[PDB]
Design a protein around this ligand. Sequence first.
Ligand SMILES: [Ca+2]
Ligand SMILES: [Ca+2]
Ligand SMILES: [Ca+2]
Ligand SMILES: [Ca+2]
Length: 182
Amino acid sequence: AERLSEEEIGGLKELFKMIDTDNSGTITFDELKDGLKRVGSELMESEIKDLMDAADIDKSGTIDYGEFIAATVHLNKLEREENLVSAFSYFDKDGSGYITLDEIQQACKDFGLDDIHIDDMIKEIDQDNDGQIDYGEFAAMMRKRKGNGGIGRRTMRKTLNLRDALGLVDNGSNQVIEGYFK
Ligand SMILES: [Ca+2]
Ligand SMILES: [Ca+2]
Ligand SMILES: [Ca+2]
Ligand SMILES: [Ca+2]
């Protein structure tokens, strides 16, 4: 052939194997990260599984050349959500501001959540009390409790509560189907 891929832009097809450089030509939960953590970028697990359900068109814990590009063009724009929001969306499924062990452990279906280990995890991730994770807990569960407004943990992290947002913004999307047409 003389024209089929998008090699004109940049080594993207390679960018795909650029990730699964040790697997076999597929991106699994492990290589999901291994790939971008190579170019310098640094994401957390939650981001991996977040990209699997939110980007992996065939969330099977493995991304192929196809699922790659569809998941690459997503991060290829003017988007901003490389923070806690990654899990805050999946982990904090209800996105109310907290995650009770139910939503926490549940979000770990691949972790084989158990009453032995993942159970202690309730208390292992529980940064303030209820074996739950809130925008603040999920925040202190990896970092610390800064004195800046950034705080969001449950009313116990200090003494004060928290300031309410001014409003949520969103772009939205439409209904499109692709398969035999490109
Ligand atoms: Ca791989
Ligand atoms: Ca797949
Ligand atoms: Ca919630
Ligand atoms: Ca808690």
